Amino acid sequence: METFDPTELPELLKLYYRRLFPYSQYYRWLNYGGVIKNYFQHREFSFTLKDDIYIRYQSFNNQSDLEKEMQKMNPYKIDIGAVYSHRPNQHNTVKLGAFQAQEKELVFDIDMTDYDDVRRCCSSADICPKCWTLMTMAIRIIDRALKEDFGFKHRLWVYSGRRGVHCWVCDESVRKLSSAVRSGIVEYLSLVKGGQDVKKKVHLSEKIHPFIRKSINIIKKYFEEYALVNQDILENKESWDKILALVPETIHDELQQSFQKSHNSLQRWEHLKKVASRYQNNIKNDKYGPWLEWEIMLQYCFPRLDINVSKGINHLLKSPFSVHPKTGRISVPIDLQKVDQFDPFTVPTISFICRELDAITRDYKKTSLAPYVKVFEHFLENLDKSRKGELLKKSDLQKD
Numbered sequence: 001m002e003t004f005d006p007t008e009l010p011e012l013l014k015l016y017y018r019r020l021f022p023y024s025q026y027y028r029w030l031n032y033g034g035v036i037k038n039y040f041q042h043r044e045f046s047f048t049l050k051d052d053i054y055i056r057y058q059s060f061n062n063q064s065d066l067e068k069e070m071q072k073m074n075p076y077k078i079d080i081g082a083v084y085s086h087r088p089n090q091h092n093t094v095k096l097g098a099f100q101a102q103e104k105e106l107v108f109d110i111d112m113t114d115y116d117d118v119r120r121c122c123s124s125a126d127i128c129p130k131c132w133t134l135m136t137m138a139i140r141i142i143d144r145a146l147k148e149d150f151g152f153k154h155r156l157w158v159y160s161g162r163r164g165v166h167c168w169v170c171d172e173s174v175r176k177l178s179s180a181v182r183s184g185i186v187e188y189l190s191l192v193k194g195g196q197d198v199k200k201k202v203h204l205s206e207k208i209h210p211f212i213r214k215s216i217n218i219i220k221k222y223f224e225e226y227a228l229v230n231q232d233i234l235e236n237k238e239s240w241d242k243i244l245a246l247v248p249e250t251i252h253d254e255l256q257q258s259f260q261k262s263h264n265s266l267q268r269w270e271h272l273k274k275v276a277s278r279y280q281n282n283i284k285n286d287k288y289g290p291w292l293e294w295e296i297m298l299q300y301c302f303p304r305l306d307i308n309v310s311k312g313i314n315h316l317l318k319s320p321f322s323v324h325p326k327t328g329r330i331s332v333p334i335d336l337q338k339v340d341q342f343d344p345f346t347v348p349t350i351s352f353i354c355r356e357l358d359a360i361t362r363d364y365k366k367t368s369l370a371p372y373v374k375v376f377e378h379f380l381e382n383l384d385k386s387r388k389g390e391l392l393k394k395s396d397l398q399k400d
C-alpha cells in the first residue's frame with residue numbers, strides 16, 4: 001500500500017479469475033465431498049467490486065456457475081459466510097424469518113494492529129520481519145490448542161495478503177457448533193484482555209492451567225530474539241516505563257535503578273526475572289514464582305482474540321486465494337510444518353503471477369502461486385481421508 005498502479009487491478013483480476021484462480025481445489029473444499037445435499041448451494045459468498053461496493057448473500061449452484069459469475073463480475077475481494085437454511089440468492093422469497101445461518105467453519109482472524117500497544121518496530125499500517133514473529137507465535141499457540149486441547153483435525157491457516165493471519169477449522173462437527181460453544185472456545189483460549197486504557201492486560205492466577213504453561217513455552221522459544229533483540233522492549237526509559245507499569249508499585253524503584261546500570265534489554269530482562277520472582281503477594285505468603293514475568297511475556301507476545309469473529313455463525317471472512325486489493329498479494333495458505341519459514345513479503349502479487357503466466361494464458365502451475373495451491377491440496381487430501389475413514393465406521397455400524 002501502495003506498490004503497483006491500482007488502475008491495472010481490473011485487467012489483472014480478469015486474467016486471474018480466468019486462468020489462475022484454483023476453482024477445482026476451491027470447490028473440493030466448500031462442497032465437502034458433496035455428501036450433504038445443498039451444502040455448497042446454500043453457502044453465502046460476498047463480492048466486493050470497485051469503490052468498496054459489496055454484495056451480500058450471493059450463492060451458486062455448482063463449480064461452473066461460480067466460475068462464470070466470478071469471471072463476469074471480476075470482484076476485488078471475495079468473502080465467505082455461513083451455510084444457510086436456504087439459497088442465499090433467494091433469501092427474499094423466504095417466509096417471515098425462516099432464513100437462518102445454520103453452519104460455518106470456526107474462524108479466527110489475528111490482526112497485527114491489535115499488537116500496536118506492544119509493537120515498536122515499523123508502524124501501525126505496516127508489518128516487518130521484526131513484528132512478523134507475533135503471527136508465527138499466534139499460529140503455533142492457537143493451532144497447538146485447537147489440535148491438542150480440542151481435537152480439531154482440519155485447520156487451514158491463511159495469510160490475509162497484508163497484516164493478518166486467519167484460521168478456518170473445518171471439522172464436520174466444528175462447522176455445526178453453536179455460537180455459545182464458539183464463545184466458550186474463545187474464552188478458554190483468551191489471556192490478553194482487553195481495553196484501550198487498561199494498562200495491564202494479563203492477570204494470572206497462582207495455579208497454572210496446562211494451556212497457559214504450553215503457550216508460555218512456545219513464547220519462550222522466541223522471546224529473546226523477538227522481544228529483547230528485535231523489538232528491544234527495554235531499550236530506553238521511555239520504553240521500559242511501559243513494562244514497569246505492569247509490575248507493582250513496591251518494585252518500580254529497585255527495577256528502575258538497575259535498569260539504568262545495565263546496557264542491554266537482555267541484561268535488564270534477566271534483572272526483571274530475578275526481581276519479579278522475589279516479589280511477595282503482600283503479605284503472609286511465602287509462595288514465590290514467575291507469574292509477573294509470564295504476564296509481561298503474554299501481554300507482549302500472546303494473540304488478541306476478537307470475540308465476534310469466532311462467535312457469529314454469519315460473520316464474513318476474506319476467502320483464501322482472494323487478492324488483497326491494497327497490496328496486490330494473493331491470500332495464501334500457510335504450511336503448518338513450515339510456519340517458522342513462512343514469508344509474507346515474498347508472497348506473490350497478482351501482477352507478478354499474471355506476468356509469469358505469459359512470459360515466454362495457461363495454468364497456475366507455471367507461476368509462483370503453485371506451491372501455495374499444493375499446500376491447499378494437502379489440506380483437502382486430509383479432509384478426503386477423514387470423510388472416507390468416518391464413512392467406513394458408519395458402514396461398519398450398518399452391519400448387525
Ligand SMILES: [Zn+2]
Pocket residue numbers: 121122123126127128129130131132
Ligand atoms: Zn514491524
